[PDB]
Design an enzyme around this catalytic site. Structure first.
Site, mmCIF file in Angstrom:
data_model
loop_
_atom_site.group_PDB
_atom_site.id
_atom_site.type_symbol
_atom_site.label_atom_id
_atom_site.label_comp_id
_atom_site.label_asym_id
_atom_site.label_seq_id
_atom_site.Cartn_x
_atom_site.Cartn_y
_atom_site.Cartn_z
ATOM 1 N N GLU A 162 41.979 51.331 37.940
ATOM 2 C CA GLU A 162 42.918 50.219 37.606
ATOM 3 C C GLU A 162 43.788 50.604 36.400
ATOM 4 O O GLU A 162 43.999 49.760 35.498
ATOM 5 C CB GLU A 162 42.133 48.920 37.420
ATOM 6 C CG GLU A 162 41.480 48.462 38.709
ATOM 7 C CD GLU A 162 40.725 47.146 38.665
ATOM 8 O OE1 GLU A 162 40.248 46.740 37.562
ATOM 9 O OE2 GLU A 162 40.606 46.529 39.742
ATOM 10 N N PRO B 108 41.710 49.564 28.308
ATOM 11 C CA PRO B 108 40.434 48.862 28.489
ATOM 12 C C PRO B 108 40.210 48.298 29.901
ATOM 13 O O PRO B 108 41.127 47.733 30.464
ATOM 14 C CB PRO B 108 40.506 47.708 27.472
ATOM 15 C CG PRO B 108 41.531 48.162 26.456
ATOM 16 C CD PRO B 108 42.545 48.937 27.269
ATOM 17 N N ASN B 109 38.995 48.459 30.432
ATOM 18 C CA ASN B 109 38.588 47.962 31.773
ATOM 19 C C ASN B 109 37.133 47.490 31.710
ATOM 20 O O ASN B 109 36.399 47.969 30.824
ATOM 21 C CB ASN B 109 38.774 49.030 32.855
ATOM 22 C CG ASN B 109 38.491 48.517 34.252
ATOM 23 O OD1 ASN B 109 37.354 48.559 34.719
ATOM 24 N ND2 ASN B 109 39.513 48.028 34.933
ATOM 25 N N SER B 110 36.745 46.598 32.626
ATOM 26 C CA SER B 110 35.383 46.004 32.738
ATOM 27 C C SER B 110 34.324 47.099 32.938
ATOM 28 O O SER B 110 33.206 46.939 32.413
ATOM 29 C CB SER B 110 35.340 44.974 33.849
ATOM 30 O OG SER B 110 35.831 45.511 35.076
ATOM 31 N N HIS C 169 34.828 35.184 50.457
ATOM 32 C CA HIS C 169 34.824 35.971 49.196
ATOM 33 C C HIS C 169 33.384 36.334 48.825
ATOM 34 O O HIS C 169 32.563 35.399 48.701
ATOM 35 C CB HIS C 169 35.544 35.219 48.073
ATOM 36 C CG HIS C 169 35.712 36.038 46.841
ATOM 37 N ND1 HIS C 169 35.497 35.530 45.585
ATOM 38 C CD2 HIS C 169 36.067 37.332 46.670
ATOM 39 C CE1 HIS C 169 35.716 36.466 44.690
ATOM 40 N NE2 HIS C 169 36.063 37.586 45.325
ATOM 41 N N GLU D 188 32.384 38.449 45.822
ATOM 42 C CA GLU D 188 32.242 39.153 44.523
ATOM 43 C C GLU D 188 30.750 39.431 44.327
ATOM 44 O O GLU D 188 29.962 38.468 44.401
ATOM 45 C CB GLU D 188 32.810 38.345 43.357
ATOM 46 C CG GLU D 188 32.604 39.016 42.011
ATOM 47 C CD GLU D 188 33.232 40.396 41.868
ATOM 48 O OE1 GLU D 188 32.477 41.385 41.732
ATOM 49 O OE2 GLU D 188 34.481 40.471 41.878
ATOM 50 N N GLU E 23 47.240 41.726 40.131
ATOM 51 C CA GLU E 23 46.406 40.984 39.142
ATOM 52 C C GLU E 23 46.747 41.445 37.717
ATOM 53 O O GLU E 23 46.773 40.588 36.816
ATOM 54 C CB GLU E 23 44.910 41.108 39.448
ATOM 55 C CG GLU E 23 44.348 42.522 39.395
ATOM 56 C CD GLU E 23 42.892 42.616 39.829
ATOM 57 O OE1 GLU E 23 42.358 41.591 40.317
ATOM 58 O OE2 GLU E 23 42.278 43.700 39.678
ATOM 59 N N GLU F 33 37.430 47.258 44.060
ATOM 60 C CA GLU F 33 36.669 48.132 43.121
ATOM 61 C C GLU F 33 35.860 49.214 43.853
ATOM 62 O O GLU F 33 35.149 49.966 43.164
ATOM 63 C CB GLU F 33 35.758 47.310 42.203
ATOM 64 C CG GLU F 33 36.530 46.431 41.241
ATOM 65 C CD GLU F 33 36.960 45.102 41.832
ATOM 66 O OE1 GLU F 33 36.149 44.485 42.553
ATOM 67 O OE2 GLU F 33 38.109 44.694 41.580
HETATM 68 C C1 LIG Z 1 39.369 39.488 37.548
HETATM 69 C C2 LIG Z 1 39.417 40.936 37.094
HETATM 70 O O1 LIG Z 1 38.572 41.042 35.941
HETATM 71 C C3 LIG Z 1 38.619 42.306 35.266
HETATM 72 O O2 LIG Z 1 39.916 42.545 34.690
HETATM 73 C C4 LIG Z 1 39.955 42.728 33.264
HETATM 74 C C5 LIG Z 1 40.752 43.972 32.905
HETATM 75 O O3 LIG Z 1 40.111 45.154 33.397
HETATM 76 C C6 LIG Z 1 40.898 44.117 31.395
HETATM 77 O O4 LIG Z 1 41.887 45.123 31.171
HETATM 78 C C7 LIG Z 1 41.228 42.819 30.637
HETATM 79 O O5 LIG Z 1 42.614 42.518 30.595
HETATM 80 O O6 LIG Z 1 40.600 41.676 31.199
HETATM 81 C C8 LIG Z 1 40.655 41.549 32.616
HETATM 82 C C9 LIG Z 1 39.947 40.253 32.962
HETATM 83 O O7 LIG Z 1 38.616 40.326 32.445
HETATM 84 C C10 LIG Z 1 38.276 43.441 36.224
HETATM 85 O O8 LIG Z 1 38.396 44.690 35.551
HETATM 86 C C11 LIG Z 1 39.156 43.364 37.470
HETATM 87 O O9 LIG Z 1 38.865 44.419 38.382
HETATM 88 C C12 LIG Z 1 38.953 41.986 38.110
HETATM 89 N N1 LIG Z 1 39.573 41.877 39.448
HETATM 90 C C13 LIG Z 1 38.738 41.486 40.614
HETATM 91 C C14 LIG Z 1 37.959 40.206 40.408
HETATM 92 C C15 LIG Z 1 38.048 39.138 41.206
HETATM 93 C C16 LIG Z 1 36.990 38.062 41.218
HETATM 94 O O10 LIG Z 1 36.101 38.218 42.307
HETATM 95 C C17 LIG Z 1 39.196 38.951 42.173
HETATM 96 O O11 LIG Z 1 39.796 37.668 42.018
HETATM 97 C C18 LIG Z 1 40.248 40.041 41.996
HETATM 98 O O12 LIG Z 1 41.168 40.004 43.093
HETATM 99 C C19 LIG Z 1 39.562 41.387 41.906
HETATM 100 O O13 LIG Z 1 40.515 42.455 41.970
HETATM 101 CA CA CA Z 2 40.135 44.343 40.483
#
Ligand SMILES: C[C@H]1O[C@H](O[C@H]2[C@H](O)[C@@H](O)[C@@H](O)O[C@@H]2CO)[C@H](O)[C@@H](O)[C@@H]1N[C@H]1C=C(CO)[C@@H](O)[C@H](O)[C@H]1O
Ligand code: CA
Ligand SMILES: C[C@H]1O[C@H](O[C@H]2[C@H](O)[C@@H](O)[C@@H](O)O[C@@H]2CO)[C@H](O)[C@@H](O)[C@@H]1N[C@H]1C=C(CO)[C@@H](O)[C@H](O)[C@H]1O
Ligand code: CA
Ligand code: NA
Ligand code: NA
Lengths: 686, 691
Positions: free
Chosen positions: B155, B176-178, B398, B400, B493, B469
């Protein structure tokens, strides 16, 4: 300082927070120190928040009492009393703005304590780096111990001083399929000890749920044992979420070794039965098996010798040549069913029934079994029809080869296949290093798996016997469909070089604390070279002692492990295995010394019939039996199965006598157990 | 010593074992070096010489063969794909270890695929890969379009730099990423796109990633050699193998025309044929809206209640909790989305936050995080099914997982059965957070098994899968066409989380889209996120016209209109393109393409004479001189051009568009300007059959 006393006043616990703010406890029994001042606490994984071991303040405390009686579905007696005084202390850590509770339950026969982690602002998700539960010993005791190990308990016991463990550990760690020893002074629980001032002390845990298995690490300079939990793939020792509790840590203590065996503290500290219909379908099982053939090397689990490796769903076993050694074939299984039916057995185990055994061992193979597809020479439907016609149940075999994701993926289908084909019990196994790779057999991850398999089995009305699983901690109270584990060195090792002569005089003081063992007794031909000429292993037992194990190795699940042909040579001795009950209204521990002798009398559930067994160590034993536990006025047909005068485990193991006579509550019998010998007595009401 | 040429003669591969016994290959295109002499092989985990599967080889035998067959995708950019290559197979014997491997090379007019094959033999059965040592030696210090090499996320925004500049830019590129595990100061992900000083475009990637660890690339920035870097397991090992087995293919796609990189089907051609016999009877493209953007922007919650710190599923009683008044996944709100979908001809509605557990889902490494079965008190599964069915709408499920993968697997048969029982035929899955089991990465052999297990099981239930993911695709959709989507890259997103680079959608088709489609979730009309959530000052780096363009320039059989219905209701003239655009194509023509600058694509809607055009442009916009030679001689068409207004700009004036309808034919000419972060969309509908 807080004080707690047992209902009978013989045990005293004191608790105080020391000058560093470390929670501290001690324990005395009839004025003798059992546990010296010992600290409690945990270190948490970093995200001062890592410190959950000191800087505590005692905010509140209470003492309460409890006294209720409950009935096991199966057990050593009809009714168990749960009576204790309880101390609860609330400990606040000002530096981390968080509290824990420590709960102590003091019984007439010892102490249980656990940590409780309430839901609060500053404690939700946390990871345990180490648990720091101390058990400070009052002296250099004798211990009956096996090496601390994350992956196996299949070790012979060592008897030594605490000071001698370090020097003996290397020699104590023998070769195993999957083993991770962790310390020169690491030992497993339950740990049994004998003090010079005449006390017996057992250290163990109860209700090992959503937590990593506890081992003990000895500080052999100060004689303090400390909790040592099993690490995960990243080295962490438990993922926690409040509200949550540690398992109980138990100290069982008496001046009478028989009262250690009589203790029900482990069962009493487990949550009550969660299977509502348990009585309607959970039943004890006496079984034989297509099994010893493969353990001795006479027969194979594998269908063919032609294949270097196998790919399930691609390998076509119908195009492979039978090796002529495959014991799990329809005709052979039917002969076992006939012998089971003729002699009043409940079930027949068959191993090697399913595709995959060509590759089962030591390959870290993911898709190793499907638990569904029979070999070409095993007719599931015909064997079911035939067994049913003879009043016999087949026992399912699920060796996983420690491929745990693979087992979980197949588990609902495997259980459905059992129900569809008339199997209501399964022997599972976890031979090899765990997959997922990096995990150990006794970590939080695998503890979850074993209990998941039991809970799911309960929904299918299936009973579970799990080999190589974490050793039991009394969870059978909560889930009574867990009728067995091995989870210790069993009769199979009598084929792999032998067990120590004293082995069965220790297991009831160690392994059996927390639940029964599938020990698979009943070997009459003690020379393994009679099964397989290349195997020169000898069972360290007389025939009379093998009979004794049906009483001295308690289990609702009892195998007669020898082949029918060998039982047919000694059918007079086999009568005891045919007669002996599996479930008991009362147990009396007549004689007990760990490493030397165990003599137990049990009353067959719903009857006035009694069964006695004695198992003896390297020097044998002399019993002077009295029968005041029999009913006044009633006469009994007693059959004594004893060692002949010239019997000996090594030089003359098959030398026994059988004597029938009239017995009553005024009767007395003096009996000699040979070296590695014993005796068995059936006492049937006239 | 061994030579292989493309069918057309423009590409030449040479193979020889070098003096050390290392297998070596090179590649030329129209006389230009593409791959300098590059070694192949693997190091195996010790149970000394047995660990060596990289040199001491002898060329035992070789053959060259030709192959030419045409096959039909279930869904795709065209009706028919030609699979035409010359193949070199070499048998390499290692005397010191008494074992053989095979290396198979397939040479197409647009590039090379190679793989290792490990035959069943006395001295090779079970083995563990320590490292793969597949080299790609570059002819120069090329321009690369790259994201950081990472075991856990893709991402990331793209960087455009020289190979020599990657080391200096890596720290800045890792945002930064999760869940993220960067592995090297010079590590990059595949597919990797490059532009050479001598006029070549080079793409490095893999195909058919099955029963193996995900390949990244590690740059030797002194010699300019990329090397295979596989994803480690919890013990640091890089694949448990049993013969007979194959590595995935490694691909070098090369042309002097950037449009031919986009046109290449080497990735799909190197996957096994379709294994779903009845595929055409149940697998269908999906255009969908969702209860989604509410929660991404922070306007609404996935959570039912604000009253709980943490939840214990099966103990926490949600019927005793206060609704937070922000929970978008409520029956009445979902019915309004169904009404909008039904009125406007959408296939499906996604709902996120329908199920217990969202109060306590993010970044806790929680095992029992969801059950995929128990709806919140305000989400009536049965009523929404009945209502959706009455409106000819399917609900998209969905799942997750919060990266709690054993937990998902334990629930998976029950969760798929629940879907079938309640009329769900597609699922959006997700893996947000560090993987459980703990120590594993998103792209290791262990998780690659999981993602494909989920797809194979879904196929048995006649369920289509869209996995966020997951490991980025490698053409497995050919084999399992129920895999209609992944994210597995930086999506729309992130336009809510600070923005994507303006040039992002001019790079994804050259990188991420090689191996399969992306659920990019385009169609944001209200590009200021502060209109959804006052606390969110993120702005989508797009004009409205460019959002319409993405329905053609970001190929997928799965297309979201990601905005809320009330925002579409304000621009329904523009929304008409999203309503009209097809999802599936008989033909694609790449009209203009330069990575990082512009992409213009024409596609023929499957079973029709109708065409759809999209252009997406970078920071400086673009000028197109369109011709229409691809239209049928004699036929007249109604063309509708959705374009940037003269004063349009992604930052200063993103909502300024024009719509112009006229008669078009194969002799028509259109000159169009794309604004900065702008573009255009054209519907070309044959006059007689127009709708
Ligand atoms: C919802 C989203 O959360 C995380 O994104 C974080 C970013 O990585 C960070 O850079 C920071 O800005 O905060 C963000 C929000 O915490 C995560 O890394 C993403 O992959 C994630 N996206 C997925 C989550 C979902 C919930 O099930 C879906 O709605 C979405 O389409 C997914 O792609
Ligand atoms: Ca995502
Ligand atoms: C069958 C047996 O195999 C393994 O035992 C090995 C010993 O650990 C070693 O010391 C050495 O002597 O070799 C032995 C044979 O390889 C393993 O460790 C045991 O746990 C294992 N026993 C289980 C396997 C079975 C097959 O499913 C069952 O038949 C048996 O009852 C299990 O307890
Ligand atoms: Ca075993
Ligand atoms: Na004697
Ligand atoms: Na402009």
């Amino acid at each position: 300082q807080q004080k707690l006393t047992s209902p009978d006043g013989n045990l005293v616990l004191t608790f105080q927070v020391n000058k560093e703010g470390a929670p501290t406890y001690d324990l005395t029994y009839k004025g003798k120190v059992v546990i010296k001042p010992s600290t409690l606490g945990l270190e948490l994984k970093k995200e001062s928040k890592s410190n959950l071991y000191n800087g505590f303040k005692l905010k509140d405390a209470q003492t309460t009492t409890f006294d209720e009686t409950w009935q096991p579905v199966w057990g050593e007696e009809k009714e168990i009393r749960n009576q204790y005084n309880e101390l609860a202390v609330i400990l606040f850590q000002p530096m981390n703005d968080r509290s824990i509770v420590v709960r102590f339950r003091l019984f007439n026969d010892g102490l249980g304590f656990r940590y409780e982690f309430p839901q609060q602002k500053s404690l939700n998700y946390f990871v345990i780096k180490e648990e720091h539960s101390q058990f400070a010993m009052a002296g250099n005791h004798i211990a009956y111990w096996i090496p601390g190990d994350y992956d196996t308990q299949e070790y012979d016991y060592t008897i030594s001083r605490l000071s001698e463990i370090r020097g003996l550990m290397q020699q104590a760690i023998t070769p195993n399929s999957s083993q991770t020893p962790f310390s020169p002074t690491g030992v497993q629980t339950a740990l049994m000890m004998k003090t010079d001032d005449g006390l017996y002390i057992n250290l163990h845990e109860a209700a090992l749920i959503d937590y990593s298995c506890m081992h003990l690490n000895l500080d052999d300079k100060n004689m303090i044992f400390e909790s040592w939990l099993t690490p995960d793939a990243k080295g962490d020792k438990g993922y926690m979420q409040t509200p949550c509790n540690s398992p109980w840590r138990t100290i069982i203590v008496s001046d009478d070794a028989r009262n250690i065996l009589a203790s029900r503290i482990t069962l009493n500290l487990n949550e009550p039965c969660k299977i509502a219909d348990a009585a309607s379908w959970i039943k004890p099982v006496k079984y034989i098996g297509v099994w010893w053939d493969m353990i001795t090397g006479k027969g194979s689990w594998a269908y063919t010798d032609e294949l270097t490796s196998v790919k399930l769903g691609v390998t076509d076993y119908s195009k492979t040549k039978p090796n002529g050694k495959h014991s799990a074939n329809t005709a052979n299984v039917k002969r076992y069913i006939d012998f089971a039916a003729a002699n009043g057995f409940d079930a027949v185990l068959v191993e090697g029934w399913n595709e995959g055994w060509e590759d089962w061992f030591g390959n870290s193979k993911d898709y190793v079994f499907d638990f569904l597809t029979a070999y070409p020479d095993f007719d599931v439907q015909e064997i079911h029809r035939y067994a049913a016609s003879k009043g016999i149940k087949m026992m399912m075999h699920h060796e996983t080869s420690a491929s745990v994701r693979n087992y979980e993926r197949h588990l609902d289908k495997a259980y459905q296949f059992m129900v569809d084909n008339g199997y209501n019990s399964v022997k599972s196994g976890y031979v090899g290093n765990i997959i997922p790779r990096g995990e150990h057999h006794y970590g939080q991850w695998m503890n979850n798996h074993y209990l998941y398999a039991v809970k799911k089995a309960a929904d299918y009305k299936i009973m579970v016997n799990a080999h190589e699983a974490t050793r039991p901690t009394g969870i059978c109270r909560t889930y009574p469909n867990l009728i067995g584990n091995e989870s210790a060195r069993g009769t199979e090792y009598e084929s792999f070089g032998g067990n120590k002569v004293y082995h069965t005089t220790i297991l009831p003081f160690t392994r059996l604390v927390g639940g029964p063992m599938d020990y698979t007794p009943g070997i009459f031909e003690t020379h393994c070279n009679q099964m397989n000429p290349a195997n020169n292993s000898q069972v360290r037992s007389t025939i009379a002692r093998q009979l004794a194990l049906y009483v001295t190795m308690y289990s609702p699940l009892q195998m007669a492990a020898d082949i029918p042909e060998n039982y047919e040579r000694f059918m007079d001795a086999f009568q005891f295995i045919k007669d002996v009950a599996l479930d008991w209204d009362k147990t009396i521990y007549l004689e007990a010394e760990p490493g030397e002798y165990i003599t137990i009398a049990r009353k067959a559930k719903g009857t006035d019939d009694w069964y006695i067994g004695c198992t003896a160590g390297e020097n044998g034993h002399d019993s002077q039996l009295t029968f005041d536990f029999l009913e006044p006025g009633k006469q009994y047909v007693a059959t004594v199965y004893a060692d002949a005068k010239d019997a000996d485990w090594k030089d003359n193991p098959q030398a026994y006598t059988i004597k029938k006579g009239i017995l009553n509550n005024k009767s007395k019998l003096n009996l000699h157990a040979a070296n590695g010998g014993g005796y068995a007595i059936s006492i049937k009401e006239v």
